[PDB]
Amino acid sequence: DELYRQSLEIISRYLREQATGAKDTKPMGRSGATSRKALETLRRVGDGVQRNHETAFQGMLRKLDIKNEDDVKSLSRVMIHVFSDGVTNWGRIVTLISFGAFVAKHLKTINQESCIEPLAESITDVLVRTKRDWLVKQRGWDGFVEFFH
Numbered sequence: 001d002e003l004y005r006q007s008l009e010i011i012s013r014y015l016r017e018q019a020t021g022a023k024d025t026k027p028m029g030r031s032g033a034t035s036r037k038a039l040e041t042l043r044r045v046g047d048g049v050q051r052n053h054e055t056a057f058q059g060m061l062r063k064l065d066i067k068n069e070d071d072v073k074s075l076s077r078v079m080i081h082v083f084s085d086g087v088t089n090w091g092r093i094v095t096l097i098s099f100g101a102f103v104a105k106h107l108k109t110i111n112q113e114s115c116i117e118p119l120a121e122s123i124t125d126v127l128v129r130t131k132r133d134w135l136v137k138q139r140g141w142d143g144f145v146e147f148f149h
């Protein structure tokens with residue numbers, strides 16, 4: 001119940017603060033410090049990988065044809081297909097979240113900023129439902145931060 005809350009918190013914060021250039025006006029909620037270290041890891045690595053995959057991400061966005069929140073409810077299935085099953089590791093996870101961050105930037109640009117919030121949820125939903133057991137075998141986000149030092 002709570003690990004989903006933690007992950008969702010991190011992703012929503014990262015996506016918003018990537019979309020807007022701001023750094024939030026408060027700290028984090030319950031389990032806040034681990035979530036902060038995760039968010040700063042994201043700050044570094046997400047921008048790096050987004051720069052590396054600018055071409056593929058930008059062409060995919062060119063395809064995705066996103067207009068409103070209904071598009072958000074219809075994109076989760078493409079996200080699931082691309083993230084699917086097979087090789088599981090932290091790099092693919094940060095890549096998931098990083099494409100979420102680019103999508104959030106774009107949504108703010110088209111003034112459809114309100115769609116950033118369901119997006120994160122969808123990401124987070126797909127993130128837990130598909131990797132839950134493995135995440136606990138990584139003691140959650142602890143495996144994340146320690147991996148990326």
Ligand SMILES: Cc1cc(OCCCc2c3n(c4c(-c5c(C)nn(C)c5C)c(Cl)ccc24)CCCN(c2cccc4c(C(=O)O)cn(C)c24)C3=O)cc(C)c1Cl
Binds near residue numbers: 079080097
């Ligand atoms: C529609 C949508 C999806 C989203 O993300 C879904 C998963 C992330 C993603 C992947 N990929 C994406 C691509 C993409 C496509 C399609 N083609 N190319 C060349 C790229 C870069 C795009 Cl454009 C956007 C997101 C992703 C494919 C290549 C990277 N990867 C990958 C595959 C296999 C092994 C490894 C690997 C290792 O070695 O362990 C490390 N990673 C990075 C690997 C992906 O799973 C997110 C949101 C919010 C939305 Cl709404």
